[PDB]
C-alpha cells in the first residue's frame, strides 16, 4: 500500500515509451507496453485496496515532495487515499484496463496506434493524479491533464477537420470551466489560506462565522468548474460534437474519466457545499434540468454515438441531482455502475460500427439482432442497466438509492424530475435498441458487471461521506415499485411505437409542431447556436476588425506627420537667392518683433 505513486508512475512511463517509440515498434510490442502499463496500474490498485481493507479503512497520506512554497503559500505534492479516492481509483484503473485491451483489439491496422496508447496512458495518469490529490492545486493539475488528453484523443484522426473542430470546442469549454475552478481556488486561498481539502474543512466554519458570502462564491465557482468538466448546464455543448473521435477514447471519456471528474470534485468538497446549502440545491437543480434536457435531446437523435452522449449527460445530471439532495453514497454508486454499463454500451457500439462498415445512422441499419447475437446481448443488458430494469441490473439499485435520498430529504420536485428522467431514458434507450437491432473478454466482464453482480459491489464510503437519511420502509417499497413500473411502462411503450411499423411516430413527427420540436431537441435545445452567436461570432468579428493592428497605425501616425512636415519644409529650399534674402529679412522682422513684444 506504499505503492500509491506507482499508479501515477506506470502510466507515465508507458506514455513516455510509446511517445518516444514514434510508431517504429510493432503493434504487438506497443500494445503489450500500453495495456501492460494500465494492467499493472490496476493490479497495484487492487493491492492497495487489499491492504486498505486489511488496515481498518483509514485515510492514508503519501507526501512525495513540496510543489511550491512562497511564505504562507504552501502547496505540496501529496497523495491521499480514502474510500472515495479508492473507489474512484479502482473504477478508473479497472475500466481503463478493459477499454485499453479492447482498444488493443480494436485499433489494429491503424496509424497513430502508439500515439493513441500514449495519449490514453497520459489520460489514465492524469486522472489518477486527479483522484489522488490532497489539495486543490494538484487536483487542478490532474484536471488540466485530463482536459488536454481529452483534446488530444477526440481529434485523433487529425486529417478530417471536424474532428479538430470538435476537439478545439471541447478544450475551449473545458478551459472556461477550469477558469471558473481557478476562481474557486483563488477565493478559497484568499479566505481560508490553504488548498488542502481537510484543512479547508476544518478552518471553513471558524473563518466564515460572521460572513458567509465569499464561501458561497467559492462553492458556486466550484459548481461552475464541475458543470464545465461534466458537460452540464450551461457547458454541455461539447459532448455529442466531441464524439467525432474513435470509440475507446469515447468509452474512457464517458465511463470513467472525463464526465465523473466534476462529480468527484463535488463529492470531495462536500463540507463546503454542506455549509452553503443554497449552492447544493443549485447543484441539484442543474442536474435535474440537465438530465431532462438530455433525455429530450436523446429522443429525436438519429446517431447512436450522440444518443450515448445525451444518455451519459442524463446520468451525469442524475449524479448531480443525487449530490444536490445530499445523497453522496448513491451518487458514487451510480458513478461506478454508470461507468460499467456505459463502457459496455460504448464498446458494443464500436463493435456495431466495425461490423456495419463504419455506419453510424441508426435508421440505415436494421434487423441486427440475428446477424450477430453476442453484441446484441451485450447491448441489451447495457440498455437494461441504463433503463434501470428492476431486480437484475445495477442501474436500478443506483437510481433507487438516488431517488430514495431525494425523497427522504424533502425534494419532491427533484424526485419527480428523476422519475420523468427514468421514463425518458428507458424510452429512448429501447427506441435506439429497436431501431438498430430490429427491422470478447472485456465485453463479457462488463456484461457481468452490468448486472446485479456490479450492484453487489459497494464502495467503502463509510467514514468519508455523510450517511444519507434513511427512508421509511413502506415509502421505500412504494418508490421501488413506482420506479420499476415507470421503467417497464416506458420499455413497453417504446416497443409499441418503434418495434412494429411506425404509425404514431411519423404522424406526429411530420407535423409542423412535431418537426419544430424535433429540430429544436436535435440541436441540444439551441445552445450551440446561442454560444456561436453570443461568444464565437463576436470573437471572429473582433479578430477580423483588429487584424490590421489599429494601435500600430495609431502609433505610426506621428511618423506620417514627420514625413509630411519634412516634405512641406523641403519646398522652401527652392534654390532662389532672392527668396533666401527675403527669408532672412522675414526672420529679422520676426525676431525683432518678438524682442519688442517682450
Amino acid at each position: 500500500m506504499n505503492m500509491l505513486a506507482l499508479t501515477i508512475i506506470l502510466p507515465l512511463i508507458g506514455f513516455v515509451l510509446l511517445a518516444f517509440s514514434r510508431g517504429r515498434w510493432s503493434e504487438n510490442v506497443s500494445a503489450i507496453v500500453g495495456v501492460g502499463s494500465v494492467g499493472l496500474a490496476a493490479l497495484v490498485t487492487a493491492f492497495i485496496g487489499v491492504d486498505f481493507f486489511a488496515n481498518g479503512e483509514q485515510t492514508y497520506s503519501q507526501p512525495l515532495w513540496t510543489w511550491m512554497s512562497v511564505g504562507d503559500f504552501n502547496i505540496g505534492f501529496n497523495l491521499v487515499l480514502d474510500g472515495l479516492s479508492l473507489t474512484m481509483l479502482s473504477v478508473v484503473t479497472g475500466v481503463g484496463f478493459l477499454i485499453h485491451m479492447y482498444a488493443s483489439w480494436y485499433m489494429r491496422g491503424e496509424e497513430g496506434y502508439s500515439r493513441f496508447f500514449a495519449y490514453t496512458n497520459l489520460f489514465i495518469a492524469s486522472m489518477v493524479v486527479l483522484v489522488l490529490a490532497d489539495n486543490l492545486l494538484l487536483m487542478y493539475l490532474g484536471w488540466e491533464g485530463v482536459g488536454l488528453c481529452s483534446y488530444l484523443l477526440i481529434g485523433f484522426y487529425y486529417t478530417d477537420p471536424k474532428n479538430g473542430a470538435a476537439a478545439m470546442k471541447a478544450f475551449v469549454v473545458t478551459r472556461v470551466g477550469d477558469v471558473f475552478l481557478a476562481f474557486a481556488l483563488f477565493i478559497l486561498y484568499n479566505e481560508l489560506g490553504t488548498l488542502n481539502f481537510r484543512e479547508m474543512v476544518e478552518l471553513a466554519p471558524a473563518h466564515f462565522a460572521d460572513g458567509n458570502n465569499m464561501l458561497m462564491w467559492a462553492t458556486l465557482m466550484l459548481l461552475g468548474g464541475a458543470v464545465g468538466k461534466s458537460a452540464q448546464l450551461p457547458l454541455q455543448t461539447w459532448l455529442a460534437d466531441a464524439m467525432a473521435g474513435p470509440t475507446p477514447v469515447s468509452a474512457l471519456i464517458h465511463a470513467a474519466t472525463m464526465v465523473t471528474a466534476g462529480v468527484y470534485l463535488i463529492a470531495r468538497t462536500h463540507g463546503l457545499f454542506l455549509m452553503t446549502p443554497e449552492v447544493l440545491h443549485l447543484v441539484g437543480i442543474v442536474g435535474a434540468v440537465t438530465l431532462l434536457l438530455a433525455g429530450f435531446a436523446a429522443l429525436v437523435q438519429t446517431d447512436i454515438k450522440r444518443v450515448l452522449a445525451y444518455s451519459t449527460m442524463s446520468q451525469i445530471g442524475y449524479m448531480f441531482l443525487a449530490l444536490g439532495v445530499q445523497a453522496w453514497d448513491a451518487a458514487i454508486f451510480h458513478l461506478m455502475t454508470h461507468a460499467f454499463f456505459k463502457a459496455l454500451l460504448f464498446l458494443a457500439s464500436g463493435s456495431v460500427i466495425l461490423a456495419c462498415h463504419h455506419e453510424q445512422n441508426i435508421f440505415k441499419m436494421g434487423g441486427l439482432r440475428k446477424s450477430i447475437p453476442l453484441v446484441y446481448l451485450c447491448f441489451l443488458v447495457g440498455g437494461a442497466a441504463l433503463s434501470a430494469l428492476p431486480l437484475v441490473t445495477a442501474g436500478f439499485f443506483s437510481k433507487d438509492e438516488i431517488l430514495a435520498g431525494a425523497m427522504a430529504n424533502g425534494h419532491i420536485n427533484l424526485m419527480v424530475a428523476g422519475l420523468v428522467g427514468a421514463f425518458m431514458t428507458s424510452l429512448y434507450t429501447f427506441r435506439m435498441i429497436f431501431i438498430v437491432f430490429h427491422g470478447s473478454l472485456p465485453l463479457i466482464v462488463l456484461l457481468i458487471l452490468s448486472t446485479f453482480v456490479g450492484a453487489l459491489i459497494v464502495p467503502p464510503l463509510q467514514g468519508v461521506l455523510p450517511q444519507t437519511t434513511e427512508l421509511a420502509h413502506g415509502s421505500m417499497l412504494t418508490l421501488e415499485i413506482t420506479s420499476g413500473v415507470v421503467a417497464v411502462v416506458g420499455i413497453l411503450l417504446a416497443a409499441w411505437l418503434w418495434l412494429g411499423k411506425r404509425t404514431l411516430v411519423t404522424s406526429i413527427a411530420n407535423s409542423a409542431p412535431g418537426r419544430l420540436l424535433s429540430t429544436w431537441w436535435y440541436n441540444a435545445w439551441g445552445f450551440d447556436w446561442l454560444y456561436d452567436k453570443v461568444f464565437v461570432k463576436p470573437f471572429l468579428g473582433i479578430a477580423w476588425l483588429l487584424k490590421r493592428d489599429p494601435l500600430n497605425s495609431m502609433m505610426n501616425i506621428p511618423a506620417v506627420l514627420s514625413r509630411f512636415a519634412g516634405k512641406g519644409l523641403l519646398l522652401s529650399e527652392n534654390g532662389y537667392l532672392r527668396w533666401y534674402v527675403a527669408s532672412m529679412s522675414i526672420g529679422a522682422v520676426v525676431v525683432l518683433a518678438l524682442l519688442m513684444v517682450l
Partner: protein, 504 residues
C-alpha cells in the same frame, strides 16, 4: 568580482570570432560555443557559490556580490555591478539562451559569419550588463549599446525571403522605438540625479544613493512615467508594441536573434529593480493604469495572435500577451505575485525559445511561413510536430510546465490584491488557449493545402533535437519542481516588495 568578466567574456569571444574568421569559415561558431559555455559555467558557478537558498531579507540594498570601478568621476559615474538572486537567474537564462542561439545557427557556411557572431555576443554582453549593472548611466549604456547589433543583424542578416526595404523598415522602427524610450529614460535619470544633487550636494549616479532622495509628488510621478515608458516599449506594452512582430518576422531565419535579443525581457527586471524601489508612491498611484494596460495587452495580444497568418508573428503576439500578464504581476505589491512573475518570465523565455527554434526549422523544411499554405504536417515530419505541440501546450498555461506555475502564482497574488483584474486575466488565459489551439490546427493538422506539405520532409538532426529536448526537460522540471528557482529569488523579491509596501 566575476561580474566584470561575466560581461567581458562575451565581448572578447565576439572579437575572437571576428578575428579567427580568417582561420576558416567553420571556426568562429566553435569559438562562440566555447565562450558561451564558459559564460554559462561562470553563471552556474555564481549560482552554486552564492548560497541563495538560505539567504534572508536584510532590506534594499542587499547584493550577493558587487564590483566597483570609477568610470566618469566628474558625474560620480562608476562601472558598478551587483548580483543577487533575480540578477543571477536572468544571467543564467541569458547564458542558456545564448548557447541555444549559437547552436541554432550552426548550419551557416556563409562568407561573413564572423561579424554575425560578433554582433550576437555583443547583444549577449549588452543584455548581461543590463542585468548586472545597477549604476544608472551604465545600465542605460548597456540598454542602448545592445541596440546597435540588433539593428545590424535584423537589417543585414535578416529574413532572406523578404526584400531589403522591409528588413530595413522593421529594424529602423525597432531602433527608433527603443532608443527614443532610452532617451526619455535618460531624461528621467538625469532629473532624478539633479533632484538628488539639489537635496544633498554630491554627484551620484549610484542606485543605492538615489533611493534616499526626497521628491515631491508630481515630479516623482514624471520620473516614474519616463521609466515606465522605457520599460513599456521594451516589454512591450500596448500601444507601444508595434516594433515586436516586425522585428520578429524580419529576424534572421535561423532564429538566433529572437532568442538572444528579445526573448529575455529586460523591462520587467527594470521595473522590479528600478521603477518600484526608486518610485514607490508613484508606482502605487500608477498601479491601476499599469494593470489595466496589462489587461488590454493580454486581450489585444490574444486577438492579434488568433488573427495572424504568420507563425513567427503569432509567437510575437504570444510574447505580448504573456508580458501583459507579467505587467499585471509587477504592480500588485505581493510576494506571491512577484515570485510568479519571475517564474513566468523564465518559463516564457524557455517556451518562446522552443517555439521560435521549431518555427525556424519548419521554415527551413518547407521554405514558407504562411499558415494557409501548410496543413496535415503531423504525418510529414518525424519530431517537429510533436515538439511544437508540446510547446504550444506549454504556452497556453499547462501544468507540468512552468508557465502554469508562474501564471497561477501571479493570479493568486493579484486576487489577493485586486480580484477583477485577476478574473479578466484568467479569461485572457482562456483566449491564450484559443490562439494556441488555432495555431496548432492551422499548422500541423488537417489536409495538405499546398504541394510542399504533400511530400515527405527530412527529419531534424541530432543537435537541434538535443537542444529542443533540453528545453522540454527544463520546462517540465520547472513545472514540476520550481522550488530551487523560488528559493533563489526569494531574498531579492522580498527586499523589493518590503521596500514597495513599507514606504506607503
Amino acid at each position: 568580482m566575476l561580474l566584470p568578466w561575466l560581461i567581458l567574456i562575451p565581448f572578447i569571444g565576439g572579437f575572437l570570432c571576428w578575428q579567427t574568421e580568417r582561420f576558416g569559415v567553420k571556426v568562429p561558431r566553435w569559438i562562440a560555443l566555447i565562450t558561451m559555455g564558459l559564460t554559462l559555467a561562470l553563471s552556474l558557478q555564481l549560482w552554486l557559490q552564492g548560497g541563495y537558498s538560505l539567504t534572508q531579507s536584510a532590506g534594499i540594498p542587499q547584493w550577493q556580490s558587487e564590483f566597483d570601478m570609477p568610470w566618469i568621476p566628474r558625474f560620480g559615474i562608476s562601472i558598478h555591478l551587483a548580483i543577487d538572486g533575480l540578477s543571477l537567474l536572468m544571467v543564467v537564462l541569458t547564458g542558456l539562451l545564448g548557447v541555444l542561439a549559437v547552436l541554432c545557427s550552426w548550419k551557416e557556411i556563409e562568407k561573413y559569419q564572423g561579424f554575425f557572431h560578433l554582433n550576437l555576443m555583443w547583444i549577449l554582453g549588452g543584455v548581461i550588463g543590463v542585468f548586472l549593472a545597477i549604476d544608472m548611466f551604465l545600465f542605460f549604456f548597456f540598454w542602448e549599446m545592445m541596440l546597435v547589433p540588433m539593428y545590424f543583424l535584423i537589417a543585414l542578416w535578416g529574413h532572406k525571403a523578404s526584400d531589403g526595404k522591409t528588413r530595413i523598415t522593421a529594424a529602423t522602427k525597432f531602433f527608433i522605438y527603443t532608443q527614443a524610450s532610452g532617451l526619455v529614460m535618460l531624461i528621467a535619470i538625469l532629473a532624478l540625479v539633479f533632484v538628488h544633487y539639489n537635496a544633498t550636494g554630491v554627484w551620484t549616479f549610484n542606485y543605492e544613493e538615489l533611493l534616499n532622495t526626497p521628491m515631491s509628488s508630481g515630479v516623482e510621478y514624471l520620473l516614474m512615467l519616463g521609466f515606465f515608458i522605457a520599460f513599456a516599449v521594451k516589454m512591450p506594452v500596448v500601444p507601444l508594441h508595434g516594433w515586436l512582430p516586425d522585428a520578429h518576422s524580419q529576424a534572421p531565419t535561423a532564429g538566433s536573434v529572437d532568442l538572444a535579443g528579445i526573448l529575455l525581457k529586460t523591462a520587467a527586471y527594470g521595473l522590479l529593480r528600478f521603477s518600484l524601489p526608486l518610485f514607490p508612491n508613484a508606482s502605487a498611484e500608477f498601479a491601476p493604469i499599469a494593470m489595466w494596460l496589462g489587461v488590454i495587452g493580454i486581450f489585444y495580444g490574444a486577438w492579434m495572435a488568433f488573427a495572424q497568418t504568420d507563425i513567427k508573428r503569432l509567437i510575437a503576439y504570444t510574447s505580448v500577451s504573456h508580458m501583459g500578464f507579467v505587467l499585471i504581476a509587477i504592480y500588485t505589491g505581493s510576494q506571491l505575485a512577484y515570485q510568479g512573475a519571475v517564474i513566468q518570465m523564465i518559463a516564457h523565455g524557455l517556451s518562446a525559445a522552443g517555439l521560435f527554434i521549431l518555427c525556424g526549422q519548419l521554415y527551413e523544411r518547407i521554405h514558407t511561413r504562411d499558415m494557409r499554405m501548410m496543413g496535415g504536417l503531423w504525418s510529414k515530419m518525424k519530431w517537429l510536430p510533436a515538439l511544437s505541440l508540446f510547446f504550444a501546450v506549454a504556452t497556453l498555461g499547462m501544468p507540468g510546465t512552468g508557465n502554469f506555475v508562474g501564471e497561477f502564482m501571479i493570479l493568486f497574488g493579484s486576487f489577493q490584491v485586486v480580484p477583477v483584474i485577476t478574473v479578466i486575466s484568467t479569461f485572457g488565459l482562456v483566449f491564450a488557449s484559443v490562439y494556441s489551439l488555432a495555431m496548432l490546427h492551422r499548422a500541423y493538422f488537417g489536409k495538405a493545402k499546398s504541394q510542399i506539405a504533400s511530400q515527405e520532409l527530412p527529419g531534424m538532426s541530432l543537435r537541434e533535437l538535443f537542444m529542443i529536448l533540453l528545453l522540454v526537460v527544463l520546462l517540465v522540471l520547472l513545472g514540476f519542481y520550481p522550488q530551487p528557482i523560488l528559493d533563489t529569488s526569494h531574498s531579492a523579491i522580498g527586499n523589493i516588495q518590503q521596500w514597495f509596501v513599507n514606504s506607503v
